[PDB]
Amino acid sequence: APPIMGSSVYITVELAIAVLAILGNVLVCWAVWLNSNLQNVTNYFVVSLAAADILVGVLAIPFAITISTGFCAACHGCLFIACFVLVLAQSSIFSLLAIAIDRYIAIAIPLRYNGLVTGTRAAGIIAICWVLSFAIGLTPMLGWNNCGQPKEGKAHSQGCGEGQVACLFEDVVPMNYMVYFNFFACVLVPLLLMLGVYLRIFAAARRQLADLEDNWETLNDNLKVIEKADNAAQVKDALTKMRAAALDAQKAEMKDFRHGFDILVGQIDDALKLANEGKVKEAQAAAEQLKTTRNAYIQKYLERARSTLQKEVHAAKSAAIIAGLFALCWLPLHIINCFTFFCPDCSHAPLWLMYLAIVLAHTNSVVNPFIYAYRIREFRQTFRKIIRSH
Ligand SMILES: CC(C)CCC[C@@H](C)[C@H]1CC[C@H]2[C@@H]3CC=C4C[C@@H](O)CC[C@]4(C)[C@H]3CC[C@]12C
Ligand SMILES: CC(C)CCC[C@@H](C)[C@H]1CC[C@H]2[C@@H]3CC=C4C[C@@H](O)CC[C@]4(C)[C@H]3CC[C@]12C
Ligand SMILES: CC(C)CCC[C@@H](C)[C@H]1CC[C@H]2[C@@H]3CC=C4C[C@@H](O)CC[C@]4(C)[C@H]3CC[C@]12C
Ligand SMILES: CCCCCCCC/C=C\CCCCCCCC(=O)O
Ligand SMILES: CCCCCCCC/C=C\CCCCCCCC(=O)O
Ligand SMILES: CCCCCCCC/C=C\CCCCCCCC(=O)O
Ligand SMILES: CCCCCCCC/C=C\CCCCCCCC(=O)O
Ligand SMILES: CCCCCCCC/C=C\CCCCCCCC(=O)O
Ligand SMILES: CCCCCCCC/C=C\CCCCCCCC(=O)O
Ligand SMILES: Nc1nc(-c2ccco2)c2cc(Br)ccc2n1
Fold first, then answer.
1. What is the distance in A from the centroid of ligand 7 to the CA of 129?
2. Rg value, the chain, Cα
3. Atom 24 of ligand 1, nearest CA residue
4. Which residue out of 26, 67, 69 has the highest number of ligand 5 atoms within 8 Å of its CB and is therefore the one to mutate?
5. Which cysteines are disulphide-bonded?
6. 333 C-alpha to ligand 9 centroid (Å)
7. Ranges assigned E (strand) in the chain
């Protein structure tokens, strides 16, 4: 059948993806520009990620449509339009890894986050990652290419000139670069690292929620121990444990919360002094006053601390879904290259499956805007206001 028909479907789908990639991600940038609650270090990597997706529609997809024709071109000029999508993919990987590392620092050392992770440092990391993305993505133009061994028979059949070749991705880009350098080293290793970071994020959230529920249980259990205690020494032991737990909890409205721990520790010292003197019932009476402090202040510190950890877990899930959808969208194309490279006895995957795998990789530049909308209320509400006014 005529090649213009099957290519028309591929081209039409590519252009539809480009439109959606530009529209959705332009909205992400316009949301972060306007709303100050979205202006933070995390979302500066989101903007860098959205910028890469905008460039996929404006340049990469036009490039991909061009290299599918096999048009005559200078080999090094063909390399650039073939490799530019590798630059944008590498930029996305750096932004996805930075987002993960940003969320691990947030939950692992929240007290040192704002001093450690600032906006100026984020902007410099973003600039460095783009320079490295060009270096990694355009490595074939530094000599690791097939321009030295051009397919002259195919170039003659298409009437290409001297120094020109039929511009096709797999004719100019070497497969050992695509499998070993690009996929294994620059894509797969970073993605595995992301997995480990998110594993350490969810493990750190689980341990911190459990510790909160341990401290809360220790206070209530030791209160019951004091109630049913028979001697002052038993009261002393329970209060000594309770004081350490409260001071550890204090380490982890805010003024009204620290005033609650001031009352709690002080109240424990009141009962502890009576216990050391030997006055049991007075110590037990003083220990029951802790319950009023528990209800008014401590239970509020628990429920707010627990809510904050859950909002960090939910945010880390949203970020992990984005990174996971990147892998799902790009892995088919990379897996096909492994078959081409490692199994020379296998038949090359058919042209229609190549186009489908290429289209799937480009579709990843459309999905992030939808994930933010469904999973992040601040982005969702800013999208409504932008769309309504305009
Ligand atoms: C600022 C941005 C938007 C401008 C982008 C310019 C792009 C379109 C330019 C920069 C380099 C150019 C390529 C450089 C060399 C060649 C070899 C020639 O035999 C065919 C055209 C081709 C393949 C060019 C296509 C267009 C190209 C990719
Ligand atoms: C990434 C997740 C979703 C799974 C991806 C699975 C895809 C990429 C795998 C599953 C089965 C694979 C195919 C199995 C058999 C062949 C026949 C061989 O002669 C060419 C490659 C080809 C056509 C493989 C291409 C890649 C393939 C389609
Ligand atoms: C953690 C996961 C996603 C990493 C990616 C798995 C990749 C590297 C694996 C999964 C299936 C594998 C392929 C399965 C079958 C064949 C056919 C064989 O004749 C050559 C190796 C080759 C082509 C393998 C290459 C590597 C491969 C593509
Ligand atoms: C083929 C050439 C490849 C390079 C394409 C780049 C063209 C320029 C397009 C977008 C650059 C965006 C710069 C954004 C400035 C920083 C945003 C900000 O912090 O305010
Ligand atoms: C902001 C929008 C940017 C502009 C995008 C322009 C869309 C270009 C679409 C397809 C480019 C195809 C170029 C021609 C392919 C080579 C044909 C040939 O010479 O054999
Ligand atoms: C042969 C290629 C070798 C690499 C050379 C470098 C090419 C240019 C690379 C990146 C351009 C700079 C983009 C920086 C954007 C950062 C925006 C910001 O946050 O301030
Ligand atoms: C594949 C290409 C790799 C080439 C090696 C890259 C070298 C650059 C590495 C790290 C750059 C770090 C930024 C240093 C600037 C000063 C930072 C600061 O002021 O604290
Ligand atoms: C983090 C995972 C990435 C590292 C995976 C390491 C796997 C080692 C890679 C290759 C091992 C042997 C390759 C076999 C040689 C055949 C090459 C060929 O067919 O041309
Ligand atoms: C999420 C839905 C999952 C289904 C996706 C459907 C897309 C097609 C998937 C695999 C197609 C495999 C085609 C095998 C080509 C074999 C070529 C040959 O004859 O040797
Ligand atoms: N074999 C092959 N791999 C790729 C590719 C890029 C990243 C991973 O794989 C590719 C990309 C475009 Br865009 C067009 C054709 C392609 N062909």
1. 9
2. 30
3. 77
4. 69
5. 72-160, 75-147, 78-167, 343-346
6. 12
7. 72-74, 164-166
Is residue 303 in a domain? yes
Ligand closest to 15 (CA) is 5
Domain that holds residue 314: 184-326
Burial 285-304 (b: 16+ CB within 10 A, else e): ebbeebeebbeebbeebbee
CA distances in angstroms from 206 to 99, 209, 211, 251, 324, listed in the order given: 20, 5, 9, 18, 21
Same domain, 109 and 241: no
Task: Give the experimental resolution in Å.
Answer: 2.5
Strand partners, 166: 72
C-beta neighbour count of 52 within 10 angstroms = 23
| DSSP-based three-state secondary structure for 253 | coil
Cβ–ligand 1 distance for 172 under 6 Å, the answer: no
DSSP, collapsed to helix, strand or coil, labels residue 128 as helix
Q: Which residue has the tokens 């797999």?
A: 170
- Residue 323 Cα to ligand 4 midpoint, Å, equals 23
Q: Both 372 and 275 in a single domain? A: no
Q: Would you say residue 336 lies in a domain? A: no
Query: Is 269 in contact with 242 (CB distance < 8 Å)?
Result: no
Could you tell me which residues come within 8 angstroms of residue 97 by beta carbon, excluding any fewer than 6 positions away?
190, 193, 194, 197
Two tokens, residue 38: 């979205």
Same domain for 317 and 208? yes
Structure tokens at 305: 């601390």
- Can you tell me the distance from the alpha carbon of 192 to that of 189, in angstroms, rounded to the nearest whole number? 5
Tokens 């990987």, located at residue: 93
Asked if the structure places residue 337 within a domain, the reply is: no
361 and 214 both lie in a single domain: no
Q: Is 390 helix (H, G, I), strand (E, B) or coil?
A: coil
Experimental method reported for this structure: X-ray
Atom of ligand 1 nearest to the CA of 58: 3
Do residues 363 and 214 share a domain? no
In a shared domain, residues 139 and 267: no
Strand, helix or coil for residue 147? coil
Ligand 6 site, CB within 6 A:
123, 126-127, 130-131, 134-135, 138, 141
In one-letter notation, the amino acid at residue 286 is: A
Which residue's alpha carbon is at the smallest distance from atom 13 of ligand 5?
66
For residue 338, being part of any structural domain is answered with: no
Question: 114 C-alpha vs ligand 10 centroid, how far in Å?
Answer: 40
The domain that holds 228 is classified in CATH as 1.20.120.10
